[PDB]
Amino acid sequence: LPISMSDEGDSFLVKDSLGENKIPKNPSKVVILDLGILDTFDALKLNDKVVGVPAKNLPKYLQQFKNKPSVGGVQQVDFEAINALKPDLIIISGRQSKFYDKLKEIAPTLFVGLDNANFLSSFENNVLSVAKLYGLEKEALEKISDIKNEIEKAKSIVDEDKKALIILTNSNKISAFGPQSRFGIIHDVLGINAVDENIKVGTHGKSINSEFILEKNPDYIFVVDRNVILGNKERAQGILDNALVAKTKAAQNKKIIYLDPEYWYLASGNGLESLKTMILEIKNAVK
């Protein structure tokens, strides 16, 4: 379900997939739990509206927020901190949906979910809905147009015949993801063909081994290394350092692509600049 808003008229009546809220126009004390939308606040010059962020996890591209009051991490939420800030709005995405009832007792709580089946339409709806609260629809529509142009430049160079596999690596485990997954933008938005369009799963992906990778023989392997986010010693490059992976088209053409997990694993797709960075990361890998 998209966000819908009716102007009423010091405030908006907002309906999203989790419920209904009255949100004041121009909210001045916003707690943000979704890192993508935090990046959109910066892109829209709304940094001064923000009073709390998840400071524990904060990635390198969001360091302008490192001194804001912390409300928790990528996973954990500090409810006492949120209450003490006395916010006028809390913004969450999918990862925080299980905190919704408790957050909504504190302040009106806006859900900016990304729909894995309809990524771009959800992205546009999230960004424009935030922009509408501040009367910044014109500025948001220009930036959305810029992202769309970057997508078209990127799609333009995709090879119709080559196929990719997306994997998440864990220290001793490889899991595969396909279209309409949490990493699905590679396939669904940029149009890169999948070695297996039928993985169709929920959150954990399909457990695979190197024999599977060779059998599929992908032209490209996009790797999201969860070892980096956890600080382990072992690295995807080591997990994939075997004779089976080495025979693959991807290995032979050095198209084993190690994506930045601070974008892909943390799921910063609601960010006007972070989504661009991700699009460019794919484009530059396949060009």
From TrEMBL:
Protein name: Enterochelin uptake periplasmic binding protein
Binding site for Zn(2+) 3: H187, E197
Similarity comment: Belongs to the bacterial solute-binding protein 8 family.
Binding site residues for Zn(2+) 1: E142, D146
GO MF annotation list: metal ion binding
GO biological process entries: iron coordination entity transport
Example of a GO cellular component annotation carried by this entry: outer membrane-bounded periplasmic space
InterPro entries documented for this protein: ABC_transptr_periplasmic_BD (IPR002491), Bact_iron-sidero_bind (IPR051313), FatB (IPR033870)
Stretches of the chain forming a coiled coil according to its record: 137-164
Intracellular or extracellular location(s): Cell envelope
Residues spanning the membrane: none
Pfam families recorded: Peripla_BP_2
Keywords: Coiled coil, Ion transport, Iron, Iron transport, Metal-binding, Signal, Transport, Zinc
UniProt: Fe(3+) 1 binding residues: H204, Y265
Residues binding Zn(2+) 2, per UniProt: E160
Fe/B12 periplasmic-binding domain segment(s): 29-287
Record: residues binding Fe(3+) 2: Y265
